[PDB]
Design a protein around this ligand. Structure first.
Ligand code: NAP
Ligand code: FOL
Ligand code: MN
Ligand code: MN
Ligand code: MN
Length: 159
């Protein structure tokens, strides 16, 4: 099973100048809980944005060019990325925009955080078709001293 996990600001913005400009510790904790002990697939730009391997997860990087770091696994196509995960129950695709586009048709589950924040970005989560997806979990949180915007954790499953 393939799942996508992402945090979206207003208008499905997910990034700006290869960075995420907000800081929402509660959402990063949600990301860690839902990805720990699973393989994570990311594109090369997202690998550069994170800047280090994510511990406790098999890190698989998509790139058309040879890898430059043997602490992670480098693959050259979607099918190779999936194969490199082995026989696991759930593969987590962690972006970015181009990678989300390619894996969305193959995904059964979306873990989405909706952040009530406006930021002028250059990368968006794919337009998906709402009729294809059922909301099975949602949890709203107001802003607090640690998290400066309100946010909503949602899990969608393909109908
Ligand atoms: N808010 C969130 O949830 C979230 C999550 C992830 C990322 N982001 C943000 O998203 C942005 C990065 O997204 P992005 O769309 O620019 O890039 P990306 O999807 O992270 O990376 C794209 C790169 O991945 C490689 N790639 C993708 N598909 C491939 C394929 N089928 N075969 C081989 N290589 C493939 C290519 O690398 P080569 O050029 O080396 O061939 C391509 O240039 C950043 O702003 C980051 O902060 C946000
Ligand atoms: N909901 C969601 N939020 C995100 O921030 C997110 N980020 C990415 C890509 N970028 C990043 C950037 C940093 C870390 C990171 O530092 N993660 C630590 C945080 C642990 C914690 O804060 O408790 C990790 O071990 O996962 C992960 C992904 C992909 N999907 C996402 N999905
Ligand atoms: Mn092929
Ligand atoms: Mn197999
Ligand atoms: Mn806000």
């Amino acid at each position: 099973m393939i799942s996508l996990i992402a945090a979206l600001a207003v208008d499905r913005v997910i990034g700006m100048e290869n960075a995420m400009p907000w800081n929402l510790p509660a959402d990063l904790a949600w990301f860690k809980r839902n990805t720990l002990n699973k393989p994570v697939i990311m594109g090369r730009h997202t690998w550069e944005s994170i800047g280090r391997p994510l511990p406790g997860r098999k890190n698989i990087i998509l790139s058309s060019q040879p890898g430059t770091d043997d602490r992670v696994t480098w693959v050259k196509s979607v099918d190779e990325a999936i194969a490199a995960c082995g026989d696991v129950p759930e593969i987590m695709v962690i972006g970015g925009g181009r990678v989300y586009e390619q894996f969305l048709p193959k995904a059964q589950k979306l873990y989405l955080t909706h952040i009530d924040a406006e930021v002028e970005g250059d990368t968006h989560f794919p337009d998906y078709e709402p009729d294809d997806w059922e909301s099975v979990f949602s949890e709203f949180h107001d802003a607090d001293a640690q998290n400066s915007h309100s946010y909503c954790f949602e899990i969608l499953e393909r109908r």
